Amino acid sequence: MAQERKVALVTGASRGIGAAIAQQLIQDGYFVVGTATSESGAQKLTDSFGEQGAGLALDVRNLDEIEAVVSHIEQNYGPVLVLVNNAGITKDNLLLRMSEDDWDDILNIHLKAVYRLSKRVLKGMTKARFGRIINISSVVAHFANPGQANYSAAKAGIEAFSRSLAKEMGSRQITVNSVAPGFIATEMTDALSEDIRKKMSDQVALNRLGEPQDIANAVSFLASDKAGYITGTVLHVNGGLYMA
Amino acid sequence: RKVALVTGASRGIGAAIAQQLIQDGYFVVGTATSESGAQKLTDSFGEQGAGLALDVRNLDEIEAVVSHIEQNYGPVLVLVNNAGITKDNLLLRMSEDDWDDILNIHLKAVYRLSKRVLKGMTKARFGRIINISSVVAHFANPGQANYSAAKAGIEAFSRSLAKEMGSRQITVNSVAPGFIATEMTDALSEDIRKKMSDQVALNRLGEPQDIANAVSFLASDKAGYITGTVLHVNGGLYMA
Amino acid sequence: MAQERKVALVTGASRGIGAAIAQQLIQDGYFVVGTATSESGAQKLTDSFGEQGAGLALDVRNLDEIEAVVSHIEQNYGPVLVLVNNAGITKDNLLLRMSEDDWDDILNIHLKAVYRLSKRVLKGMTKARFGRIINISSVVAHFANPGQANYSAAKAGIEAFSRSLAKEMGSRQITVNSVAPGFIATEMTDALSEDIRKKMSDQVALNRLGEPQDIANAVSFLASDKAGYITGTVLHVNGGLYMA
Amino acid sequence: RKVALVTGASRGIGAAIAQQLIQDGYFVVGTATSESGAQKLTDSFGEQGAGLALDVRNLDEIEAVVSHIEQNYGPVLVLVNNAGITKDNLLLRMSEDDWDDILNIHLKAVYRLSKRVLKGMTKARFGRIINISSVVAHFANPGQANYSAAKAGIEAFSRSLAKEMGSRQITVNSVAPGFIATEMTDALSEDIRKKMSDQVALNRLGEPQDIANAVSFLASDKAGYITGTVLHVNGGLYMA
Numbered sequence: 032m033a034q035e036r037k038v039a040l041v042t043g044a045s046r047g048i049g050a051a052i053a054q055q056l057i058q059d060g061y062f063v064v065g066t067a068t069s070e071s072g073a074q075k076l077t078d079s080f081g082e083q084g085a086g087l088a089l090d091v092r093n094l095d096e097i098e099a100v101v102s103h104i105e106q107n108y109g110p111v112l113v114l115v116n117n118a119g120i121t122k123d124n125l126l127l128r129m130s131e132d133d134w135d136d137i138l139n140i141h142l143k144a145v146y147r148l149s150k151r152v153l154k155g156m157t158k159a160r161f162g163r164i165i166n167i168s169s170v171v172a173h174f175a176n177p178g179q180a181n182y183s184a185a186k187a188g189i190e191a192f193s194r195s196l197a198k199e200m201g202s203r204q205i206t207v208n209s210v211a212p213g214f215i216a217t218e219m220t221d222a223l224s225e226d227i228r229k230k231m232s233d234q235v236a237l238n239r240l241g242e243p244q245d246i247a248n249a250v251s252f253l254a255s256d257k258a259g260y261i262t263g264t265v266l267h268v269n270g271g272l273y274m275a
Numbered sequence: 276r277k278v279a280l281v282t283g284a285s286r287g288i289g290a291a292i293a294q295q296l297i298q299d300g301y302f303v304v305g306t307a308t309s310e311s312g313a314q315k316l317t318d319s320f321g322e323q324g325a326g327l328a329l330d331v332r333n334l335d336e337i338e339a340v341v342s343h344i345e346q347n348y349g350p351v352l353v354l355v356n357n358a359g360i361t362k363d364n365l366l367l368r369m370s371e372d373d374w375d376d377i378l379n380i381h382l383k384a385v386y387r388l389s390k391r392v393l394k395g396m397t398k399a400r401f402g403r404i405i406n407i408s409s410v411v412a413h414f415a416n417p418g419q420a421n422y423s424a425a426k427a428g429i430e431a432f433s434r435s436l437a438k439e440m441g442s443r444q445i446t447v448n449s450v451a452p453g454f455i456a457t458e459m460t461d462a463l464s465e466d467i468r469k470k471m472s473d474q475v476a477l478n479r480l481g482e483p484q485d486i487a488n489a490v491s492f493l494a495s496d497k498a499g500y501i502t503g504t505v506l507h508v509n510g511g512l513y514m515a
Numbered sequence: 516m517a518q519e520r521k522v523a524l525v526t527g528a529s530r531g532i533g534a535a536i537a538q539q540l541i542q543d544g545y546f547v548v549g550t551a552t553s554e555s556g557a558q559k560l561t562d563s564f565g566e567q568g569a570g571l572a573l574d575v576r577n578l579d580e581i582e583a584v585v586s587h588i589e590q591n592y593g594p595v596l597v598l599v600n601n602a603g604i605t606k607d608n609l610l611l612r613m614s615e616d617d618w619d620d621i622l623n624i625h626l627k628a629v630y631r632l633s634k635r636v637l638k639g640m641t642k643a644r645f646g647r648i649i650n651i652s653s654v655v656a657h658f659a660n661p662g663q664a665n666y667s668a669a670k671a672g673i674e675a676f677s678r679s680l681a682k683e684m685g686s687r688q689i690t691v692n693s694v695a696p697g698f699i700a701t702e703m704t705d706a707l708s709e710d711i712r713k714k715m716s717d718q719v720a721l722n723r724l725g726e727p728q729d730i731a732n733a734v735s736f737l738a739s740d741k742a743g744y745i746t747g748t749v750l751h752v753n754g755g756l757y758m759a
Numbered sequence: 760r761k762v763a764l765v766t767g768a769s770r771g772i773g774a775a776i777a778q779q780l781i782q783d784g785y786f787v788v789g790t791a792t793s794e795s796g797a798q799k800l801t802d803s804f805g806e807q808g809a810g811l812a813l814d815v816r817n818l819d820e821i822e823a824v825v826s827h828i829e830q831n832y833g834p835v836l837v838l839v840n841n842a843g844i845t846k847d848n849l850l851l852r853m854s855e856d857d858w859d860d861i862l863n864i865h866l867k868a869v870y871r872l873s874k875r876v877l878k879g880m881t882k883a884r885f886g887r888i889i890n891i892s893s894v895v896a897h898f899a900n901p902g903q904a905n906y907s908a909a910k911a912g913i914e915a916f917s918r919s920l921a922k923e924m925g926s927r928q929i930t931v932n933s934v935a936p937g938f939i940a941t942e943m944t945d946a947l948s949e950d951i952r953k954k955m956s957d958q959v960a961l962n963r964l965g966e967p968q969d970i971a972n973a974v975s976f977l978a979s980d981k982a983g984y985i986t987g988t989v990l991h992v993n994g995g996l997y998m999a
Contacts (some may be wrong), residue, residue: 036968038990051847069387072918074309097967102737109812110838110987124925126870126877126919126920126923126934127874127877127878129870129874133816134867134870137867138912142862142908142912144860144906145864146853146904146908150853151405152280152850153850153851154851157811165303169361172759172915174758174759175720175758175759175918175919175921175922175987176919176922177754177919177923178919178923179919180872180915180916180919180920180923181515181914181920183916183919184782184866184870184912184913184915184916185912186915187912187914187915188866188908188909188911188912188915189908189913190461190911191357191896191899191907191908191910191912192904192907193350194514194907195850195899195901195902195903195907195908196850196898196904197476197511197514197899197903198476198511198514198899198901199849199850199898199901199902199904201475201476201477201478201510201511202476202477202478205478213500230976235441235658236438236440236441236442236502236503237441237444237446237500237502238441238442238444241500242500245499245500245501248404248497248498249497249498249501249974251497252492252498257488257489257491257492258488259485260453260481260482260485260508260509261485261489261506261507261508261509261510262476262477262511262514263511263514263899264506264507264514264515265477265515266501266504266506268501268942269500269501269502269505270441270500270501271437271438271441271502271659273504274434274437274438274502274503274504274658274659275430275431275434275505275658275659283675299701302589306781318621334615353693366633366634366637366679366680367637367638368685369630369634374627378622378626378627379580382622382668382672383618384663386613386618386664386668387657387700388712389610390610390611393610393611394729398585400910413999414676414998415675415678415679415680415681415682415998416679416682417678417679417683418683419679420630420679420680420683421630423675423676423679424577424626424630424672424673424675424676424679425672426675427672427674427675428626428668428671428672428675429668430671431656431667431670431671431672432664432666432668434659434667435610435659435660435661435663435664435667435668436664438609438659438660438661439609439610439661439662447889457581461530464615471645476899478740490619502661505654509897514898514997515897519904525884538957576858592981597785599764599792601947605804610916634863678998681960681995681998682960682995682998685959685960685961685962685994685995686960686961686962688961690961697984713774719925720909720924720925720926720987721925721928721930721984721986722926724924724985725986729983729985732981733981733985735981736976736981736982741972741975741976742973743969743977744937744961744965744966744969744971744992744993744994745973745990745991745992745993745994746960746961746994746995747995748991748999749983749999750988750989750990751985751988752984753856753984753985754924754925754984754985754986755818755921755925755986755987757924758918758921758986758987759914759918759987759989
């Protein structure tokens with residue numbers, strides 16, 4: 032029988048923030064397609080989602096794969112009406128040691144992928160007169176961090192792109208927003224020491240690291256009818272690490 | 276139930292906030308400027324709320340209202356500071372009273388009421404202070420220097436207070452409405468409303484419920500890691 | 516003989532930032548009126564400025580004094596065409612210990628004075644089709660600081676007021692801007708320990724406290740013809756303490 | 760004299776910047792897209808400057824140009840990254856090349872040239888990197904998603920780099936022009952220009968010199984405590 036739920040596409044859905052976002056959108060009643068870089072990673076997503084989603088392998092650096100994935104979704108599940116662009120790969124270095132590849136790969140994975148995927152889903156959202164594009168940004172697009180000139184430039188570019196797109200698509204009722212996580216507990220933070228997690232949490236007004244679910248909760252809100260008059264904004268979810 | 280206090284709950288944004296927080300499961304105390312307005316709120320909320328008269332310009336009234344809530348219903352654990360009164364004028368025409376009354380109603384009230392609810396929230400290790408700001412704290416609108424100053428003041432206040440209270444798991448945030456359909460804007464002409472909605476990316480005025488939805492989100496466990504921020508609800512009128 | 520230079524009014528000109536701003540505007544060719552809270556403080560300013568400025572006693576909390584001072588300047592020296600609103604008094608306390616007076620006095624000294632003085636000088640600047648209103652704000656209008664809810668609210672209100680006023684007066688070519696100092700060396704910072712000044716300077720990208728002259732340099736730029744297309748902005752002078 | 764390198768120095772904002780920095784006392788190397796344009800700059804600058812051909816999309820050219828400057832004139836101690844090329848289109852019509860060419864010309868060039876000048880500035884314990892951004896990195900203009908992304912990218916880049924280089928007394932800042940009169944805007948109609956200047960609080964388009972004045976300020980000792988900021992030069996078109 033036919034897939035009748037609205038379709039959400041969450042890139043980088045294997046773990047942490049992306050995993051929580053995908054699961055929450057399933058809970059919210061979407062049919063969720065999540066992506067992983069590998070086929071075995073995709074198969075794990077398929078396992079996790081069961082009969083209310085699918086896992087697909089996608090290297091977001093490649094236009095042909097983006098186009099193939101979205102076409103596959105359209106042909107099998109439905110038009111992508113919620114797009115969550117989620118990527119957290121970093122290639123950090125002070126600028127004097129930041130290579131051409133450190134730069135290009137991060138700009139491609141983060142910002143170019145947002146451009147390509149957003150462009151690819153617009154026709155479906157225009158036809159529906161409904162759409163949500165939700166970009167996962169970062170506190171470091173706002174708060175300066177040495178060694179991450181590449182990642183910061185990408186995330187800031189994503190927020191500016193989102194403003195531009197929000198203006199272009201707003202008459203059609205499609206909203207385009209970013210969520211900027213702060214210090215969220217991930218495999219990366221789990222790998223740090225307790226002392227270093229304390230040094231982080233002391234900087235957060237709420238005195239703790241966040242959880243992937245806090246980011247999922249923000250995305251869930253923005254993807255819902257409770258957020259239909261919010262567009263071109265950055266929703267900061269950082270426990271008061273960065274306020275203004 | 277936890278108690279929420281929502282000022283200026285008679286109509287528009289305040290009324291929609293109060294009704295939503297009831298639906299969310301809070302016991303809602305709403306305030307109005309007169310005893311008569313307060314009765315209308317009592318009548319609207321029934322067993323899930325109460326109406327009180329309050330002139331938010333008056334400290335003695337603020338302290339009596341909160342004391343009355345503590346004695347009868349319980350500690351105020353969600354505070355929504357909601358004011359929409361304007362006294363617009365170009366600066367050359369803006370009187371001392373136009374300046375003062377807007378700074379008092381909007382920003383001073385936020386200082387006073389926030390201070391008065393700290394003790395209960397501190398003891399609970401739970402709190403939500405949610406301040407209604409405005410898009411005009413960010414985008415300059417000629418004639419509203421008083422209103423814009425007050426609301427920007429509120430946002431900075433909120434940041435300071437979020438840092439002070441965060442270890443107790445009390446969040447302090449602002450919601451900044453854009454052009455929201457009200458009696459005020461219904462009273463305007465068709466051409467005027469058109470010029471407003473043409474500035475909005477979504478090409479429409481918002482509704483009080485859009486603001487209530489944002490406050491409801493922030494007041495819930497779904498926003499427990501969000502503090503010291505401004506949640507812009509303006510349809511892309513202003514993007515930041 | 517008649518006073519022919521354009522007149523600048525710098526409130527709080529006794530020391531530190533205000534003193535440097537007043538001296539620099541004299542260097543720039545203005546006739547500078549500076550204010551102090553006391554008559555003896557005013558007399559020291561008069562001494563400092565010599566025949567190219569004047570010191571006047573002003574408690575910026577009082578409308579009658581504001582009106583008297585500006586009238587005195589108009590009657591003796593000329594129309595106020597550069598207004599620098601400079602105040603650094605604080606009454607810090609966590610909100611639970613912040614009195615009605617802690618709140619009201621800071622909002623009056625900072626924000627109400629900006630409203631009153633700006634309003635009072637507009638007629639002269641309108642007639643000249645030239646004006647500069649330069650408000651000294653603070654990094655804490657942006658970067659959250661516990662214990663300064665009063666001061667932060669005031670300074671943020673000042674920046675929003677400046678935007679409103681800039682829009683109202685822009686057709687007449689009057690610019691309205693704020694300068695937001697960071698950690699600047701003052702009597703207050705001199706009173707701190709060397710260890711505490713180090714802890715401050717480690718937070719500044721430039722690895723040092725600023726000087727009053729750095730703020731004077733910013734005000735000088737904004738008051739000049741080099742800044743005639745800049746209005747409604749905040750010029751941050753903080754060594755990278757706060758960037759965005 | 761200290762050497763300044765100003766890209767895109769042939770006309771408009773770049774030309775005004777280059778001429779101002781000469782007046783300020785810098786030896787200015789200006790770049791143009793062709794050998795012929797480069798000669799015109801040599802001819803304009805005379806003994807106080809030099810013109811070089813540079814395609815800022817090409818890393819080998821960037822490295823050769825800077826090497827040529829180091830060998831002949833001295834270390835680049837002021838770098839002004841100035842690009843104004845647009846390839847506008849609604850996203851639905853924006854090609855891969857429209858996206859890439861604008862990201863490369865604007866943001867990649869800033870990455871490449873900034874990296875290449877660090878060593879000289881580090882040794883000198885003096886530097887100014889001044890990046891020309893745009894009001895559109897802040898205020899969304901439909902059709903300019905590429906340009907807006909690139910310039911916002913530049914601003915965040917600058918913040919990161921300011922933190923890395925600040926201990927060496929190297930400042931990194933952006934200047935964000937609004938609507939500035941150029942050949943581009945001279946080519947537009949009277950009605951179009953009117954609609955632009957009506958959005959500006961000062962009710963006029965700016966001039967290239969207004970931008971040159973801002974860059975000159977930032978490049979001087981008068982701005983030695985300013986780093987990681989955006990200096991908005993837009994006549995109140997956008998206020999923040």
